[PDB]
Amino acid sequence: TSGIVPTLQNIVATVTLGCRLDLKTVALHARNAEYNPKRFAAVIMRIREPKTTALIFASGKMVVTGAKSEDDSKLASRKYARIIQKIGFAAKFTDFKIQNIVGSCDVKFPIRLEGLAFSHGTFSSYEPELFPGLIYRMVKPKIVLLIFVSGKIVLTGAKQREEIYQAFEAIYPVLSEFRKM
Amino acid sequence: SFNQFVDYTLQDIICEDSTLILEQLAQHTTESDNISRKYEISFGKIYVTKPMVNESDGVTHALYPQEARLRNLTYSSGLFVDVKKRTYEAIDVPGRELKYELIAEESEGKVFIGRLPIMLRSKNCYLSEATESDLYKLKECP
């Protein structure tokens, strides 16, 4: 009905290796590493071809972010695992789960945030003195949407590409009902 | 009596215990913490406004006796006092008297300390400067 498919900006994925790593050695022998114990208890590294950032902990846990697609995230995680293997630590690809999906879109018209906050008061939370965007907590699917006056919608919380599309399709009518002028 | 009180006795009362000084001694636990501080709060002059009322929404406006009587409001004015906040510090060498010195932190503003009821036809009331025509306009009996 809407005719516009929201585009996924970010992908947060989690992977495990099952082996203990030496952060000092990884930092010294890695091209792009940032090991600051005072700052954080993990090594921050980044790769360019996928344009992604990975946080690697001493417990063998890796958190990949920045991927624009599920297969791109898979490729980035595989390359990270290969980099660690080349470093020498016993790292094997294991459970890779996407824990967060972020998407964006625009409805191409202004939206009455006060009207939405009054009509749908069980799901919306509008406090314009802190953030200039209404927060809508859709219950099914369980997702959080940020609605702005400029007609831009940000979706976050989905674990799969289906949930975010379903949420946008379910929120489009109530958004259209509250168009300014 | 009321005029004398408001004119002089308020300042006299505030000029008795104006200074309150709290001293935090060295509290010797390590050689890197041996400075002793002294915080002083002092009251200076006192200012009194004209009778005013603040509404529920937070808007304040001048109050007249007729409106006070009709609205069950207290005919009173606000009291303000200048407050000086000083802080001294000294090196607490063991077994010696201290020499408190200002640490270049001497803050100094008017602080609201309550509302003083105002006797009618007094120096601080609106009707003391009102003529017969002014009283008739203000709905007061000459």
Binding site: - | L79, V111, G114, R115
Partner: protein
């Protein structure tokens, strides 16, 4: 340290208002009475 909380104006305001509204000259009795307006001489 917040001066707005260090100094509570309600102390003075409520003390004076109570002592004047009621005749209890504290925090003697009958110090304050409702003015008689039955007649001018009264």
């Amino acid at each position: 340290f917040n001066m707005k909380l260090a100094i509570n104006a309600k102390t003075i305001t409520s003390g004076l208002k109570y002592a004047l509204a009621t005749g209890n000259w504290g925090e003697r009795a009958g110090v304050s009475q409702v003015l008689n307006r039955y007649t001018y001489s009264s």
